[PDB]
Amino acid sequence: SSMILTQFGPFIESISGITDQSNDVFEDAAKAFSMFTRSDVYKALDEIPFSDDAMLPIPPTIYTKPSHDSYYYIDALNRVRRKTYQGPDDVYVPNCSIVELLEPHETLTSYGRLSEAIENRAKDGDSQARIATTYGRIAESQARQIKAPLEKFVLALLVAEAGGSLYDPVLQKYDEIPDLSHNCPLWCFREICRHISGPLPDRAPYLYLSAGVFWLMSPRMTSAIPPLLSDLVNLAILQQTAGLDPSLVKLGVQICLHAAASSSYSWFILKTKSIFPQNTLHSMYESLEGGYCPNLEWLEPRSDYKFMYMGVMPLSAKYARSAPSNDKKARELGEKYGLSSVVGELRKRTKTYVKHDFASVRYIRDAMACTSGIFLVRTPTETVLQEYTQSPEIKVPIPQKDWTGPIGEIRILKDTTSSIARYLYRTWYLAAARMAAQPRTWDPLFQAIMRSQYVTARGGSGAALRESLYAINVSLPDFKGLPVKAATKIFQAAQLANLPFSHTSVAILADTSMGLRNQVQRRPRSIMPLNVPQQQVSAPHTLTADYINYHMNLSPTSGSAVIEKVIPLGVYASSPPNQSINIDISACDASITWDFFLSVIMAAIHEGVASSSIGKPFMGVPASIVNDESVVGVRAARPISGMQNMIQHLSKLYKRGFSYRVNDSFSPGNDFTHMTTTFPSGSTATSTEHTANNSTMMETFLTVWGPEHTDDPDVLRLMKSLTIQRNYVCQGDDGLMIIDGTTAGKVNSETIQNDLELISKYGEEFGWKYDIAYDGTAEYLKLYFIFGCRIPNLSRHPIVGKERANSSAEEPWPAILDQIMGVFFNGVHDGLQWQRWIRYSWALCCAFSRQRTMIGESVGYLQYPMWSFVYWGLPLVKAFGSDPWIFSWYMPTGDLGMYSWISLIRPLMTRWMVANGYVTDRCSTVFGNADYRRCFNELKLYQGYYMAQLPRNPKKSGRAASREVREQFTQALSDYLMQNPELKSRVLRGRSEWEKYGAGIIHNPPSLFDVPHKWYQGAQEAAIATREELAEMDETLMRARRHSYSSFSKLLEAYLLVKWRMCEAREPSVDLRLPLCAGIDPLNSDPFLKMVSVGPMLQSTRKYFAQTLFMAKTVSGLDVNAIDSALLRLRTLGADKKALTAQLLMVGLQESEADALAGKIMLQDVNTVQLARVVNLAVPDTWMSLDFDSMFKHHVKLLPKDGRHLNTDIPPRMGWLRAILRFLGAGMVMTATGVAVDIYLEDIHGGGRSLGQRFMTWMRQEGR
RNA sequence: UUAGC
Ligand SMILES: Nc1ccn([C@@H]2O[C@H](COP(=O)(O)OP(=O)(O)OP(=O)(O)O)C[C@H]2O)c(=O)n1
Ligand SMILES: Nc1ccn([C@@H]2O[C@H](COP(=O)(O)OP(=O)(O)OP(=O)(O)O)C[C@H]2O)c(=O)n1
Ligand SMILES: O=C1C=CN([C@@H]2O[C@H](COP(=O)(O)OP(=O)(O)OP(=O)(O)O)C[C@H]2O)C(O)N1
Ligand SMILES: [Mn+2]
Ligand SMILES: [Mn+2]
DSSP, X not given: OHHHHHHHHHHHHHTTTSSOOOHHHHHHHHHHHHHOOHHHHHHHHHTOOOOGGGOOOOOGGGTOOOOGGGGEEEOTTSOEEEOOSXXXXXXXXXXXXXXXXXXXXXXXXXXXXXXXXXXXXXHHTOHHHHHHHHHHHHHHHHHTOBSSOHHHHHHHHHHHHTTOSOEETTTTEEOXXXXXXXXXXXXXXXXXXXXXXXXXXXXXXXXXOSSOEEEEOOTTOOTTHHHHHHHHHHHHHHHHHTOOOHHHHHHHHHHHHHHHHSSOHHHHHHHHTTHHHHTTGGGTTSSOOEEEEEEEEEOSSGGGOBEEEEEEEXXXXXXXXXXXXXXXXXXXXXXXXXXXHHHHHHHHHHHHOOEESHHHHXXXXXXXXXXXXXXXXXXXXXXXXXXXXXXXXXXXXXXXGGEEEEETTEEEEOTTOOSTHHHHHHHHHHHHHHHHHSSGGGOHHHHHHHHHHTOSSSOOOHHHHHHXXXXXXXXXXXXXXXXXXXXXXXXXXXXXXXXXXXXHGGGGGSOBOOEEEEEBTEEEEEEOOOOHHHHHTXXXXXXXXXXXXXXXXXXXXXXXXXXXXXXXXXXXXXXXXXXXXXXXXXXXXHHOXXXXXXXXXHHHHHHHTHHHHOSOOBTTBOOEXXXXXXXXXXXXXXXXOHHHHHHHHHHHHHHHOEEEEEEETTSTTEEEXXXXXXXXXXXXXXXXXXHHHHHHHHHHIIIIIHHHTOOOHHHHHHHHTOOTTTSEEEETTEEEEEEOOBTTBSOOHHHHHHHHHHHHHHHHTTTOEEOOBOSSOEEETTEEEETTEEOOOGGGSOSSBOOOOSSSOOOOTTHHHHHHHXXXXXXXXXXXXXXXXXXXXXXXXXXXXXXXXOSSSOOEEEEOOHHHHHHHTOOOSSOTTOOTTOBOTTOOSHHHHHHHHHHHTHHHHHHHHHHTTOEEEEEETTTEEEOHHXXXXXXXXXXXXXXXTSOSSOOOTTOOOOHHHHHHHHHHHHHHHSOSHHHHHHHHHHHHHHHHHTBTTBSOXXXXXXXXXXXXXXXXXXXXXXXXXXXXXXXXHHHHHHSOOSOOOHHHHHHTTEEEEEEEEOOOSXXXXXXXXXTOSTTSHHHHHHHHHHOBOOBOHHHHHHTTOSOSOOSBTBOHHHHHHHHHHHHHTTOOHHHHHHHHHTTTOOHHHHHHHHHHHHTOOOOHHHHHGGGTOXXXXXXXXXXXXXXXXXXXXXXXXXXXXXXXXXXXXXXXHHHHHHHHHHHHHHHBSSSOEEEEEEEETTHHHHHHHHHHHHHHHSOO
């Protein structure tokens, strides 16, 4: 550690709260990090006096592995396959030797890559060579699933941990987290690596590079070492920053060692990933004596996902685990995988917790953080053959007699059918009719928005489309000479812009390209990049599904992302007397096939949509005629609408299946097209479609099936008490059944179990394998809840990991910083020990803030000041002579954040600046007689501030584009969007109207006429950058570092004029014994105190924020938030109604709606959040889990504590000021360590009025 | 070649 101490001494003290932080020391540390060689990090590890408790037997078979060759074979289709040994799953990367297949590297003689000789043979067609190349490429792919070299994270840990224990400012004592000499993952990392390197000077087992991965030429290396080491590093960092229990952490290391000890690390990890969750979370409190759980009320309507805290629910044996015992299966799993030692220890401990409190949930959390975080990996061929193969077993098919004759591609399900499909058909028919009935549906703008949804800078199987079109002799414009990426649906859109649906129809059956995705703790999933016509024709399906989810069920739309994964719902459902069954449907995509669902859904939509869509085109699709054979004998022609024409074509594809074109770049020679009937993921229907069937079937069960299959009075009573509208929330294939409790306690466990067995039996009838889980836990959207307490899953957030499906190289330097920030933010959301985490983040950042640059022997260096990370969101540990750890990680981001920390120590700064020569005769309004301009330029505070706001990736704009083809393109884009003249006429109106009432007021008019340009811009930036464009990026950042400044942004200079007075701490908003988020307990002072004083956000953030916009959606390409800002800004700037009416016309609205909303906006009392946008203020993400709405409303007094001040009074017409003022107050409160405090407006330098003009100046100057 | 939200 003397190696580390000597080289980072001063820096360590700065991020440990002992010494102030200075950019001079930060940048040096950066340079030290950059000069540390990989073997040096191991040399440093050697200096650690590890304790015996940090050691455990390392399996000798982790080193000696068999040849890879016996693990593969060539199949009947000549594709290189993984040869199974431990079951159908044994398809991942096998644990084998690999040195024998490498050629030493030219320079790094001790490291090696796959022999070029072997690849050439493989490329020639040699079976043995292909087998070896595949194994080589896949094993390499496995090692790449990390963000940067493991040594960088380790070195950072060493530097951060050299600071020793950290003193808690609030608790007033040092933490008792064991030092590194007790870190078992680290000890293993050093020992395993040292054992591999052996006599070799090079200490690294492998090198994560750009030229690819290279392996240390040791006969002890294994394809499993990269993943294993990656797991140990995460655990190493977490034991120190999450304050994890070392004893548990070892159980986690043991499993990993066993994974490396197995024949396939990846596979073993997958089969045992449930060990920690099963032996703790799903086995808590078989005995219960005390503790408290939340007591929440679900507000009406339940669809708002809004709850209110009502106190605490004392716990007793009355609430002990009533759900079935998983002991037997749990021990069986351990026995089968040689981990019964771990399982047992886990069970024995889980039993000692008889009180539900901070101690026990932290235990669960702790346990669940020890699960491997590797992104499982296997060759594309293997994913495709395992995912697009299995078919649903429809145990009770729809009788063939129950279909009518064909109506084109569809057959109506007779209304005499006795099949359960009867109900599935009614629901889709109803929704389809009502949706097509809505007037909006027929509005040109709406159809433009829909058509735009899939016009993105993402792929759409471009090539395949082109050829399916060539098959019918129809060539698409190639726009030869344009600097944009051709494999984008944006490019596709332009090619198809001027072609009749009849000419592009065939493309609906074109092949699908391969798209892959690796996930932590899950198998890789294949994806289908549908093409523009395929996406277009799918609208009907998507729209009807949306109608169901918005009007007929209780569902959440999103992918996820904490808090908007509706944390509140989880607290409620998991809180006694409430109970929840976690429903899931396995192989959902393979379960939605034509045979039962799609054939029915297609028919119901086609029929229910008939009367309202009649005689009309839809989204560019014409109406037509199709053969009609419904009635026996009677065979005629039927006039169908364009919307129906869509279902007609979509039905053709769903029926045939998808032609998945598989070009496995990891497996030489594995090129094949695989036909599959599994549902598409890349469809705009997918998510919403599955969410819809989910609720529909569950509704059918609870209403029909269930009741009809049991005469059990209790099961019938329970069932009758459940409605999909109140008690069943779902998203995609995930379901959460919430059984509200009574005063008599919770519903009988045995009755619930009966109910569930009926649900299971029910699914088999139509090919669905329900994955039901009744264990006293709530698990929805990968969020874990117990007794009202959320349990973050640290293992699903690998600190070092990163999905990398493709072979392409990582993004150029800068890019990594964003990733490091995201790592920080997860730690804040996951609840790690705030100080330990903040200090480590500083070490990690500093270790990635410097990069070597080239300009032609012009060897320089790009260095980000420490101040750039603050701007990005990382709080200061201690600056300007202030006390240590006064800043919380809830410090806002950007300007709002800069204003907050600076305001919290304004005087300190001034006093310090002066005391250090930074004095002047000019008295600064914010910094008194401090020479703040000369100070910030020297410390690189301005420099860093501006560097933070510059692009972290190369820009392609500026590429020479021949004006003519450039115009043809943007023209094509335009025609695609301006298909319907009515829309265009609308925008034109807004335009001439704008020149009269709005032009001049603001300069950011969002216009549909911008879309073509924004779209082109996107297709451009999607293409690969050039080494030159990379140089231009560095030059920009490097120029901003040279330049000197005299001020901050115009807005931040305005906020600084506002001074406050922090006062009395807020009273608790929730009980202090109440466990709300494991890890967030009295042991994690700042997060914990914030949670308690501020209170938890008890509503769905998506519902909440949906109430801060006048318009929810708009043509993809425009910004809903921009439009909302433009309108409020025009209002705030005194613009006339007609001006807002003009703005709305310009983004597609009908004059009537335009005038209506315009007139509505004018007279509205805009809420804080919504209004705060006029000046680009946004609720910080880190705040999302807290009750910020209440902080704004009741704890940020705008009336000075001692009455009214001339400067503080808010001008008559400047009421909007109050919204902006609330953010500034909140900013300071949230940034200060400890309890939320009530803050009071103390002063506004030039008065409110002056401030308003200052803001309005900014407003009217935006985009000049 | 590398999807929808
Ligand atoms: N002032 C410097 C010099 C080097 N490096 C880092 O060094 C790495 C590769 O170059 P080296 O060969 O390691 O640098 P040298 O300066 O030549 O080595 P030292 O003086 O011991 O000789 C990458 C580069 O960012 C750095 O950050 N700052
Ligand atoms: N923004 C960037 C990123 C990389 N490079 C160039 O790429 C070359 C090597 O790539 P890296 O692997 O990214 O640089 P290293 O110094 O070898 O180490 P790493 O980025 O961790 O620092 C040398 C460097 O000049 C550059 O000029 N500008
Ligand atoms: O990036 C993503 C991630 C999930 N998606 C959808 O959600 C579901 C299923 O969710 P999950 O449980 O994660 O996938 P399964 O195949 O059902 O995993 P398994 O049976 O172990 O549960 C299938 C997809 O349609 C999606 O479309 N895109
Ligand atoms: Mn599933
Ligand atoms: Mn799922």
